[PDB]
Amino acid sequence: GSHMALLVEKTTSGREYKVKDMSQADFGRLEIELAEVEMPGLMASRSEFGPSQPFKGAKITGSLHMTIQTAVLIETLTALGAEVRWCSCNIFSTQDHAAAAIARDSAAVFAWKGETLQEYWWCTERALDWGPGGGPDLIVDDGGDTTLLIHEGVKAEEIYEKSGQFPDPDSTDNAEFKIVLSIIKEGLKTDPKRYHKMKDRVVGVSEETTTGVKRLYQMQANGTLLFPAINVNDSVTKSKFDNLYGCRHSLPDGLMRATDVMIAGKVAVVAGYGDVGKGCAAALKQAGARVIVTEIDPICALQATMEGLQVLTLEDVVSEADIFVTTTGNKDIIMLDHMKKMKNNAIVCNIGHFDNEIDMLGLETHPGVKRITIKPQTDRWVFPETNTGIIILAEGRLMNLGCATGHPSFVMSCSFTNQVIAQLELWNEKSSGKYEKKVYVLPKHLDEKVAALHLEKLGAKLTKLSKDQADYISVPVEGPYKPFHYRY
Template sequence: MASLHSDVADLGLAQAGVRRVEWAERAMPVLRKVHDRFAAERPLAGMRVAACMHVTAETANLLRALSGGGAEIALAASNPLSTQDDTAAALVAEYGISVYARAGIDPQSYDRNLVTVLEQRPHLLLDDGCDLVNVAHMERPELLSEAVGGCEQTTTGVIRLRRMSTEGVLKLPMVAVNDTATKRMFDNRYGTGQSTLDGIMRATNAMIAGRTVVVAGFGYCGRGLAERARGLGARVIVTEVDPVKALDAVMQGYTVLPMDEAAPIADVLVTVTGNRDVVRAEHLASLKDGAVLANSGHFDVEIDLPSLEAMSVDIRREVRPQADEYVLSDGRRIVLLAEGRLVNLGAAEGHPAAVMDMSFSVQALTVAWLAGAHSGLEPGVLDVPDGVDTQVAGLELEALGVRIDRLSPDQLEYLNSWQV
């Protein structure tokens, strides 16, 4: 299998990658059941899949399930800092999946790898941030000649897809895996909350208790981050542009301030909005000495990095792995984590495997549905098929040993009748 076309750092890391993948699999019992079902039923036989995803052990287990179902897969990274080189090697050498990903590659290589996986002329696209779909539509539309659909698993990617659909340029049916209840509740809220703080603490070794943590954005990801920061003893301030979300934060007991008032008192400032220029030059100029900046939105545009570079009077230096210090003209030091990219993947390992178990099980079942139902679908952004989310949640409860009540026939009749 090592003869597969691939571009990874070192195939000699494969056995270390296998150990990492198998460790993650222990916490992914639902996906294991999906894997076994796919291996028996082969719902993806003959399907070529192009994926742009974080090259992690959890992703490897998703791709193993799809491969077991008959899919031929080519994988590129969705973030240069999140690639686990040992996992990439294991995917190629042990699991028969073509991988084009190396940790820390430059932007040109990143873009080239996206084109390479598209050159496999895939039937299905799996995306994380809409980069793969965007490149296919903008640069190489001819490579979509055999594509029938795909999935998108991030908030940022779904936003981009909806814009493409509104403007009439989206050529494929794309399922918004991100918009399921399990994805938003567990992946975005619990996963992002824990893994973001994990990245911050690994990069800084800083105490969270007693510090002022500013969370920019109070969607599902921001809510989870705020909850976990408060649980560790931080004073949490929320910034928002949406009145409803801001009111929600107030009702949950958080202080809500505009960014120009929050930035000067932040010990740690984390953006998690999915938008650009959330922390701008005027906010950077007001940060206190030693303030830590991090981003947990998908792209590195939430913090105005060019302005930070321009304001710095000294060459940035790495004070710790994934922690770069910028010195301003008045001597203040600002610490930027993971180059302003996703801190939970750039400075840590992303979401726990138990969280990704649900998200990737939903994605796997949706891919199988697409493989069978694509002929009746129109281009646009689609919801995950009815029942998939509930099925995965039920399997997860079963794996946890949790039992719940069931509706009686009388209750079902009552809920489905308009008569008292």
């Protein structure tokens, strides 16, 4: 045993956890109570499905950011009868009071704000380690890390079974992957069939985000996907709400908390004009920034221009802009070369994925550079050539979750009601043959249902078609109301 080894603790009831400070649980509970009222989709799910306990006997592992919002989700799953283990899908996204309340009251949770990468992958392993009764039956994933671990696990287990050999980190120069290989290697010593049992038992994964979904289709394409997946991201009531309106809320929140910078009057660059970029551009524009968009897609670019935004390449604006936000799901958007051209105290952040939209590696190794931490997740990197700095948020990781609290409860209720519906579907069809080792989306009538569940809370009064009218536009009175390919 390492002096510093990571060890699980247990509640008085013997449920495992590792969180920052259990003493935060009362605070967590207070904010969860407030969130419940803001999440009518999740609460209606509890009312409708609670009494029939549809998840009885089901074991669910989840990776969604361990926020107050995720708490209300977790407690919806447990209210429906599920047993649950959880981790966060980001080193900075956990809200420690939410983690503590869940660990105390409802589920095993391995999560805290300000994890190391080593601690992060440990947490992922623990969320997946159900012990001798086995599991999980079901996965809720956000970004595909959990799913990746299982797939790399099964691979490592096959090599092991057939040649007795273990993974070797020296085999990779990717620092995070070195971590992953080491975790799997030590895992082989404790249960060298962990992942194979998992893959024979897992009924499905529901995946929350665009980047995760892209990973899944790749795995389908190359025939490596080990089980059914529901693409929750592409529900309309997710993509067109969470990705768009959620960022419109949480991008400015992240900037304000992290820097207290005035947005009005500034020039802000948004790289990407998909759903996330549209929402970020809107916030910035609405706050009185002059927004310039970068894009690779001419349709998206043309949309930006119609909204009165300038579209240029980063090179055109790098020396002039005050705020830079990456929204692409791509890599190598803002490179060291760019960063060197930025004005003193330019703010640089990523709200897309991972840590590679911004060139943090090149920044680290810039000779003479000096990192000055202003406060947690606000860092000023000082360039010696100029004695000026740039302000990096959340070390290049998701800035909204890292520097503030992510999206608000109401819009996450939309996303998370889809997650519940997705889990209920996978589970209800465990023995059906209906889902293969492919990626599926939820049908439109359920997508509409999610929206309907949220209207009353806002006092929105929907019109009802007459039969005559429904006949005329050839839709049933109760919907669905739009064609399959409708874009909203």
